[PDB]
Amino acid sequence: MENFQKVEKIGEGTYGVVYKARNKLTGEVVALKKIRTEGVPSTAIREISLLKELNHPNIVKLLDVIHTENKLYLVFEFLHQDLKKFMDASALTGIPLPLIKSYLFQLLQGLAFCHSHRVLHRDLKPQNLLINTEGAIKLADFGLARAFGVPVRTYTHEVVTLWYRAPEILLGCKYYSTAVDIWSLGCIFAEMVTRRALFPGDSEIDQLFRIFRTLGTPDEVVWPGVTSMPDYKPSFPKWARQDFSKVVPPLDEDGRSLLSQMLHYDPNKRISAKAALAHPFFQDVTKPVPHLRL
Ligand SMILES: Nc1nc(Nc2ccc(S(N)(=O)=O)cc2)sc1C(=O)c1cccc(F)c1
């Protein structure tokens, strides 16, 4: 914008670019997302306004929304690092389990909160989970297709990551449920533990089949109605479910039990964020502080 001094480009959001910026008058440092001509939906901005009144310690605060000049700017409180960079920086030693547990616990609180407010994230991934020196982690870049849409590109030729997409989405479900966020978080949880993406698909079908090769090709037994889904094909190969202890070694049984519930094929059997918070895995949860190199 004009009242902002771009310090540097932080990346590519889901609808545009993200800059670290400084409010030329207040001096506050923020994250500024620039969106996109048609004219911007009203149904969108209102689903956005909802996002403004969404205040929780594990949700990145959306400070302002400016529509002017055939471009949409979203001003967010700024955090210094995303989980993707942190995981990469921790690849050699791995993130300590107490920190992994604390982050998962906080993200479930964040989700429990948005979900109870009928708000879905829709596109959780390490790049949109932000952390601070304080040991907090927050949900960022909500993709609400109800606040806009779920396109095939961010805005200008970018390879969308499908690694965290719930199977029901890949199978053509038109109406996502809060369960899609639990699935994505489950994938992230596994990745923090093993230091390797759980399902690194390179295409929608490869994504689907990597899920199938690991969790078993779903059928009507484990997922009633799956064979009636839009993109389900009787021709899908039939892979057996892999031993789960091979999936996330060396995560303890409480952790594996919880991940297992976050990765249930049936959206209705998949654990809710509220229930996951009560899982025995969190009995000894604490809030360690990360070693952040900024
Ligand atoms: N609030 C906020 N802060 C950020 N800082 C930051 C600082 C450093 C790093 S990094 N690669 O670790 O050096 C990453 C993010 S991004 C962001 C967003 O709200 C956001 C995130 C994703 C997409 C989007 F559209 C907006």
**Rounded Cα–Cα distance for residues 289 and 102 (Å):** 9
**Rounded Cα–Cα distance for residues 89 and 94 (Å):** 9
Residue with CA nearest ligand 1 atom 8? 81
Give yes or no: residues 19 and 140 share one domain: no
Give yes or no: residues 73 and 116 share one domain: no
Give yes or no: residues 123 and 188 share one domain: yes
Q: Which of 23, 82, 154 to mutate to test the pocket of ligand 1 (most atoms within 8 A of CB)?
A: 82
C-alpha 223 to ligand 1 mean position (Å): 36
Contacts of 39 (CB under 8 A, 6+ apart): 70
Give yes or no: residues 253 and 112 share one domain: yes
C-alpha 233 to ligand 1 mean position (Å): 38
> Could you tell me if the CB of 15 is within 6 A of ligand 1?
no
**Structure's resolution in angstroms:** 2.0
Last residue of a domain, one of 80, 104, 134: 80
Lay out the sheet containing 81-82: strands in order across.
Answer: 81-82, 129-131, 137-139
Give yes or no: residues 176 and 76 share one domain: no
**Rounded Cα–Cα distance for residues 105 and 233 (Å):** 37
**Rounded Cα–Cα distance for residues 120 and 134 (Å):** 26
> Could you tell me if the CB of 195 is within 6 A of ligand 1?
no
> Could you tell me if the CB of 16 is within 6 A of ligand 1?
no
Across the chain, which distance is largest between two alpha carbons, in Å?
A: 61
For 76, the 3-state DSSP assignment is: strand
C-alpha 283 to ligand 1 mean position (Å): 31
Compute the C-alpha angle 72/77/82, nearest 5°: 100
Give yes or no: residues 73 and 85 share one domain: no
CB count in 10 Å sphere of residue 276: 26
Using an 8 Å Cβ cutoff, are 136 and 108 in contact? no
Residue 112 maps to which CATH number?
A: 1.10.510.10
19 is in an annotated binding site: no
Domain limits for position 145: 81-291
C-alpha 202 to ligand 1 mean position (Å): 24
The pair phi, psi for residue 16, each rounded to 5°, is: -175, -155
For 21, the 3-state DSSP assignment is: strand
Give yes or no: residues 53 and 183 share one domain: no
284 is catalytic: no
Residue with CA nearest ligand 1 atom 26? 141
Amino acid at 108: L
Structure tokens at 45: 């901005």
How were these coordinates obtained? X-ray
126 is in an annotated binding site: yes
Give yes or no: residues 229 and 208 share one domain: yes
Q: Cα dihedral sign for 94, 95, 97, 101?
A: negative
Catalytic residue among 64, 123, 254, 284: 123
Last residue of a domain, one of 16, 51, 80: 80
Structure tokens at 74: 């979203």
Last residue of a domain, one of 32, 49, 80: 80
Using an 8 Å Cβ cutoff, are 79 and 131 in contact? yes
Residue 3 maps to which CATH number?
A: 3.30.200.20
